[PDB]
Amino acid sequence: FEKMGIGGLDKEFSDIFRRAFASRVFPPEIVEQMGCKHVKGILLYGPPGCGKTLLARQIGKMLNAREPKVVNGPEILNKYVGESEANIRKLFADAEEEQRRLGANSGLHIIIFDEIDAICKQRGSVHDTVVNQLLSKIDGVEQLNNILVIGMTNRPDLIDEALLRPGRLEVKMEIGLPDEKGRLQILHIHTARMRGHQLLSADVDIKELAVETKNFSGAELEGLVRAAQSTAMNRHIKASTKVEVDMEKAESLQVTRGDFLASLENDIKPAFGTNQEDYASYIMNGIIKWGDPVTRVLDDGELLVQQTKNSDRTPLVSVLLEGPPHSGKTALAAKIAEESNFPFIKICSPDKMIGFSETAKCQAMKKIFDDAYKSQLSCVVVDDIERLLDYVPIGPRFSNLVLQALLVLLKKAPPQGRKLLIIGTTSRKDVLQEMEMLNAFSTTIHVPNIATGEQLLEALELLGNFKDKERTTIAQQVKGKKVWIGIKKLLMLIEMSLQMDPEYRVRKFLALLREEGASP
Amino acid sequence: DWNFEKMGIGGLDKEFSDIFRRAFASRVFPPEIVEQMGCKHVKGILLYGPPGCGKTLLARQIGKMLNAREPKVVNGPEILNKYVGESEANIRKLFADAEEEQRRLGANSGLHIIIFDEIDAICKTGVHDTVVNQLLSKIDGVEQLNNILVIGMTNRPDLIDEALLRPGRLEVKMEIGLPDEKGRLQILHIHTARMRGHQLLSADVDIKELAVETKNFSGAELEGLVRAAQSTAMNRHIKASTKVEVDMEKAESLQVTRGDFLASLENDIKPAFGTNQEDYASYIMNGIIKWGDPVTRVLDDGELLVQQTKNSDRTPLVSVLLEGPPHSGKTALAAKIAEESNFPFIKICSPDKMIGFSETAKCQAMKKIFDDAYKSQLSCVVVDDIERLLDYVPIGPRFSNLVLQALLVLLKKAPPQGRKLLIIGTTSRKDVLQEMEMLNAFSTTIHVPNIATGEQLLEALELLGNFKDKERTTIAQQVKGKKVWIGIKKLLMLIEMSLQMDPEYRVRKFLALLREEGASP
Amino acid sequence: QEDYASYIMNGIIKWGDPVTRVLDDGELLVQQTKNSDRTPLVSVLLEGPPHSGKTALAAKIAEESNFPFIKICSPDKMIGFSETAKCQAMKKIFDDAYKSQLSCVVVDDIERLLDYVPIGPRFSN
Ligand SMILES: Nc1ncnc2c1ncn2[C@@H]1O[C@H](COP(=O)(O)OP(=O)(O)OP(=O)(O)O)[C@@H](O)[C@H]1O
Ligand SMILES: Nc1ncnc2c1ncn2[C@@H]1O[C@H](COP(=O)(O)OP(=O)(O)OP(=O)(O)O)[C@@H](O)[C@H]1O
Ligand SMILES: Nc1ncnc2c1ncn2[C@@H]1O[C@H](COP(=O)(O)OP(=O)(O)OP(=O)(O)O)[C@@H](O)[C@H]1O
Ligand SMILES: Nc1ncnc2c1ncn2[C@@H]1O[C@H](COP(=O)(O)OP(=O)(O)OP(=O)(O)O)[C@@H](O)[C@H]1O
Ligand SMILES: Nc1ncnc2c1ncn2[C@@H]1O[C@H](COP(=O)(O)OP(=O)(O)O)[C@@H](O)[C@H]1O
Secondary structure, X not given: OOOXXXXXXXXXXXXXXXXXXXXXXXXXHHHHHHOOOOOOEEOOEOXXXXXXXXXXXXXXXXXXXXXXXXXXXXXXXXXXXXXXXHHHXXXXXXXXXXXXXXXXXXXXXXXXXXXXXXXXXXXXXXXXXXXXXHHHHHOOOOOOOOOOXXXXXXXXXXXXXXXXXXXXXXXXXXXXXXXXXXXXXXXXXXXXXXXXXXXXXXXXXXXXXXXXXXXXXXXXXXXHHHXXXXXXXXXXXXXXXXXXXXXXXXXXXXXXXXXXXXXXXXXXXOOOOOOOHHHHHHOOOOXXXXXXXXXXXXXXXXXXXXXXXXXXXXXXXXXXXXXXXXXXXXXXXXXXXXXOOOOEEEEEOHHHOOOOOHHHHHHHHHHHHHHHOOOOOEEEEEOOOOOOOOOEOOOOEOOHHHHHHHHXXXXXXXXXXXXXXXXXXXXXXXXXXXXXOOXXXXXXXXXXXXXXXXXXXXXXXXXXXXXXXXXXXXXXXXOOOOOOEOHHHHHHHHHHHOOOOOOOOHHHHHXXXXXXXXXX | OOOXXXXXXXXXXXXXXXXXXXXXXXXXXXXHHHHHHOOOOOOOEEEEOOOOOOHHHHHHXXXXXXXXXXXXXXXXXXXXXXXXXXXHHHHHHOOHHHHHHHHHHOOOOOOEEEEEEOHHHHXXXXXXXXXXXXXXXXXXXXXXXXXXXXXXXXXXXXXXXXXXXXXXXXXXXXXXXXXXXHHHHHHXXXXXXXXXXXXXXXXXXXXXXXXXXXXXXXXXXXXXXXXXXXXXXXXXXXXXXXXXXXXXXXXXXXXXXXXXXXXXXXXXXXXXXXXXXXXXXXXXOOOOOOOOHHHHHHHHHHHHHHXXXXXXXXXXXXXXXXXXXXXXXXXXXXXXXXHHHXXXXXXXXXXXXXXXXXXXXXXXHHHHHHHHHHHOXXXXXXXXXXXXXXXXXXXXXXXXXXXXXXHHHHOOOOOOOOOEOOEEEEOOOHHHHXXXXXXXXXXXXXXXXXXXXXXXXXXXXXXXXXXXXXXXXXXXXXXXXOEEEEOHHHHXXXXXXXXXOOOOOHHHHHHHHHHHHOOOO | OHHHHHXXXXXXXXXXXXXXXXXXXXXXXXXXXXXXXXXXXXXXXXXXXXXXXXXXXXXXXXXXXOOOOOXXXXXXXXXXXXXXXXXXXXXXXXXXXXXXXXXXXXEOOXXXXXOOOOOOOOOOO
């Protein structure tokens, strides 16, 4: 990476050079005396968009190798019986034909294979013949000494065992997310062109931009720069169409300047970063304090967050919130997850799986947990543990496969020294206990309802929407009667009651409240 | 001109503004501005949309507008030839002028505009893929070009090959949306300017009335309607059709009467989609009669809840349930409430259209309906006979789980952004729904009562219209001093059945049938 | 070597006699299976109250056996599998122990493999 200039995988490339390229830098006479052979392939897996192609391009260029070739995943698979092995054989055919002309002078024809998962046969849950031909061409009755295979993937656990035996693809490597220095380096390579012509502004602080970004991948920063320049062009056009003063201010306005900040929070939506639209959808009207239970729940959540942050013996921590229906459990869980300031946070709600079968839901949950396993910190929030299972009181009836997928994923530990936090939300804890799911968790929390008349009056006053005389009359009417109302139901009832003529407003609200239940 | 209406087309103005912003903005600035830092010159445009929505005219008018050479237009897959290599030679022949201009005039080269009619035909086995690769190499190969513009038009956007959709080859994609009411007004105005010029049109035709009546029409459909009305008007002159032809030339005086247009549109053209009719007269038939107080209360409650969902802020989702005993007239009331709502998007999902579909098909259809409702700004959807939507049988009991789960999840999914919604459901087995734990999802419920008192029965019978004072008095002699329990639909069926006897036995048969149907809860 | 390190985390604590008794029984079983000739196949079942450390003891015994072939068949590697896939995987894992002079296969969490659930009951036949 000294010659490449691009930074981010210097240690990885040094290690890979040691692993394989050590044989390419040595007295050739001792190399001949070696009597050994060279490798036949390698593998590279990691998060998407981490520049797994630039690595191959630069490494191939470094050793003065022939032109590379790129093959995508869904480039071979076809429904026809005999139209899959054709491309696999064709790719090796060109190397085979030229082997005769040189024989011993043949140079390495470095190539790139992308998304090996497409042809791999490991879908136990793509045919089972393409990989046989691939392995045979890689090695068979005849051995080819002028080939090399470089692969790419994001699901390393789905590759077949036969494709990693010592005869072929006997090495592996991983590509990880960069840190602040990596983001600084990336921002120094996708923006130097603007600096060359003095388009950038001195006010743009690269360190501030790097600090603001948390888990941006390689493509995210380039996209942010592109959007920032687009916004600068839009501002320039707005100024031009607004008023004409100089006719040379266009060049000065072409400067990106401080639009990077706006582009950060408006033009880029990282997949591994925090999401604001989920908060907007779930915590809609905002948290309004009306009692001590909210404070108790928040304190417990903060304590659990601290415990998971500062633990070494227990990398896995799981909590569970429960309460009566319409008590507002989702919002509190969303708030707790948000206020953790973790890098990775996702919500696996069931509203995104309308009409799916059991297998699709299992795959979705597995994918979400696999993504969570990557970052150095994670906080997954399972929304409804009673709608994923498809539970109906009649019967009873439910799905066993999802139950198992959940029961096994609440005890697995991350790899090496990574962390994780699993939050849950339910309303029928009794059936969960009946199903033996109540012991897999580590702690339980409660969320009570508005139960006291004074609490209801205080909550209504905080919400306002009623005048002094009306509120006093309401307080007079409630007296010592029983109160068992829900927050969501409370808001809905208030809104419905406030929809008629001003003369009859308290009357209808009181009638609806009384008609409702008054006991657990 | 930038009016976008000086041409012979209209309806899509915002898209015209967007294409003007994104296409010709760079060219307007002098070359000094471009040379300062350069720009991504665009040489790719694709157009699509509902079939026959005026896509072809946009390309022609855009080509005529720009001050450049005449664009080349190819009518579909005319490139293919019997021999080998002819297709590649033909496709190469198109770019010769561009290469010559790039070589000679360099940067200061006149723009080249290329029209591809039915690009989907050629781009989507050896010949076809070779031609596709040749096009891909020519458009973006070793030597770049910046004096070419290629525009393709299709009606199947999902068939265009992925390799051709990458940036740098097809950068601007346009969808031709349905014309609005103002677009329809403009279409009608420009489709009859000739007659007004010669003032041969009858004053009985109100263009605004046609615009209001017409809904979900393409421009070609409007033109066909106009021509069908023209033919209907012309028929009035010709007289002989079975014998040798003879025409009433002397009559002349050609006029376009409203009756001709109405008759033509009645049985000549019908829109492919957007036909929300034939159900507002099918589900609600025989009208709504005021046989007692309850109907007024139900209608008032429906109107109040509709108003609530109209102008609320923190309640973007409202649901109602109309329960009651069978044959009580539930579907008719729901249809009437929906009609009186008067919303942009309305649709009724009923099982009559899913006779034989399995669980997955029902789930997919419901999801499609609800997504369509999601799209528009605000809408009200209704569902009828839930117990039939999820096949239910008392024995066992037996039912389906996929449909129940899909329905349960879809009554609490907030609509995108600030849009609104309204859901109304119907059923007659409230107990089962409550036991399934679905009644807690619905927000409020209403009751639809039966005909209980004899006075109500007499009022309904008089309002419907039948029997007479003497027969009515005889009926009241026995029915007034008692209690009754019957539904309106059953009452209509019984009246119709008993009306088929002899004059002196109708009343006795009706009373016997009423005694047969007598019961109570 | 990674399996033993992963399944055993905080080592073994000698907090009583039962640990020694269990380890002695395991050693006796290992000796019997290595020496005898009329009983080439042996089996043993470990059970107890939940959260008592059974898998750890099984792994420790297996590592102390000093056999040439050792393997562990856990369920967490089979998330989302169907019944046929599980049967094929288990058969493959077992069929690799017939091609060596000695073997020791550990099957753990049987109740999870069979897909048990108190309601019903339900499981894979
Ligand atoms: N102090 C509060 N605690 C909880 N929720 C509150 C509070 N103040 C306001 N809310 C509102 O409560 C709503 C959260 O309830 P939510 O819609 O998530 O119900 P829920 O508990 O998931 O119920 P169910 O799953 O039965 O529908 C949010 O709209 C939030 O605005
Ligand atoms: N939205 C519209 N506004 C105005 N006129 C329209 C519209 N849609 C269609 N038309 C009319 O349609 C007629 C021709 O339509 P169109 O351009 O689709 O024809 P075409 O070339 O046969 O189409 P296609 O390529 O889809 O087969 C023109 O008279 C045009 O006035
Ligand atoms: N005020 C009214 N309300 C309802 N129906 C009325 C009224 N006046 C007359 N009718 C007649 O009663 C009919 C009721 O039939 P409808 O199919 O709507 O009942 P329904 O309860 O849906 O039947 P089912 O539930 O068994 O399908 C109306 O279609 C109409 O013919
Ligand atoms: N003497 C011991 N016997 C057993 N486990 C011990 C002993 N000393 C320490 N441990 C700890 O026991 C833990 C292993 O117990 P583990 O939770 O796997 O038990 P289990 O019975 O297999 O559980 P599960 O029922 O959840 O499958 C390891 O962390 C190890 O540190
Ligand atoms: N470590 C890195 N340093 C500089 N640029 C990077 C890096 N990783 C990714 N990029 C940028 O991301 C863009 C696309 O990366 P790509 O090769 O698609 O990643 P992947 O191999 O994961 O698909 C490239 O143009 C490259 O400039």
